[PDB]
UniProtKB/Swiss-Prot annotation:
Induction remark: By IL1B/interleukin-1 beta and thyroid hormone. Probably induced by dexamethasone, dihydrotestosterone (DHT), progesterone, retinoic acid and retinal. Repressed by the Notch-Hes signaling pathway.
Entry's family note: Belongs to the calycin superfamily. Lipocalin family.
Catalytic reaction annotation: prostaglandin H2 = prostaglandin D2
Note from the entry: It has been proposed that the urinary and serum levels may provide a sensitive indicator of renal damage in diabetes mellitus and hypertension. Elevated levels in the coronary circulation may also be associated with angina. Changes in charge and molecular weight microheterogeneity, due to modification of the N-linked oligosaccharides, may be associated with neurodegenerative disease and multiple sclerosis. Detected in meningioma but not in other brain tumors and may be considered a specific cell marker for meningioma. Expression levels in amniotic fluid are altered in abnormal pregnancies.
Protein name stated in the entry: Prostaglandin-H2 D-isomerase
Disulfide bonds: C62-C159
Length: 161
C-alpha cells in the first residue's frame, strides 16, 4: 500500500468521524457493527506518533478507547501493538486532504494478526458525501476487499463532549 506523500501530521490532528470500514475478519466486523461510532480524536504522542481516541456507544453507554500509534520510520506510517489480542499492525495514512477525508489501511506485521487487513474511512463531517463513499469503495476494491465487506458504520450523535 502507498502512504500519503509529504504527509503533514499537524494537519491530520483533531476530530474525525469513523464513517467507513472494510475488514476481512468476521469477528472484528461483527464487533464493530454492534457499536455506534461517535467521534475520534487524533493527537500527537510523546514518541513522535499519534494517540487515536475513539468514542462510541455500546449498549446505550458511552465508552472510549485510546490507541498509541507509534512512528514506523516514515511519515504517515505507524505501528500498533494490541494489548489484549496480541500481534503488531502496520498502520498507514494512504491518502488524505486533511480537511475532508482520510483513508487508512492496516495489516498485521507480526503474529497471527498478519491475517487481518482493514481499511478505514475517516471524515471531518459525521455524514460523508456520496463522493467520499465512492472513493472509499474504490480504494477497498483495489485492496482486494470483497464488496460485502465494505460497510458504512452506524453513527451516534451522543458522546460528543
Amino acid at each position: 500500500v502507498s502512504v500519503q506523500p509529504n504527509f503533514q501530521q499537524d494537519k491530520f490532528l483533531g476530530r474525525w468521524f469513523s464513517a467507513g470500514l472494510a475488514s476481512n475478519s468476521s469477528w472484528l466486523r461483527e464487533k464493530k457493527a454492534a457499536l455506534s461510532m461517535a467521534k475520534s480524536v487524533v493527537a500527537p504522542a510523546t514518541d513522535g506518533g499519534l494517540n487515536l481516541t475513539s468514542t462510541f456507544l455500546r449498549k446505550n453507554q458511552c465508552e472510549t478507547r485510546t490507541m498509541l500509534l507509534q512512528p514506523a520510520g516514515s511519515l504517515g506510517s505507524y505501528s500498533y501493538r494490541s494489548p489484549h489480542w496480541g500481534s503488531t499492525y502496520s498502520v498507514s495514512v494512504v491518502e488524505t486532504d486533511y480537511d475532508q477525508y482520510a483513508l487508512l489501511y492496516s495489516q498485521g506485521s507480526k503474529g497471527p494478526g498478519e491475517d487481518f487487513r482493514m481499511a478505514t474511512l475517516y471524515s471531518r463531517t459525521q455524514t460523508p458525501r456520496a463522493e467520499l463513499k465512492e472513493k472509499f469503495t474504490a480504494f477497498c476494491k483495489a485492496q482486494g476487499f470483497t464488496e460485502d465487506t465494505i460497510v458504512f458504520l452506524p453513527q451516534t450523535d451522543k458522546c460528543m463532549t
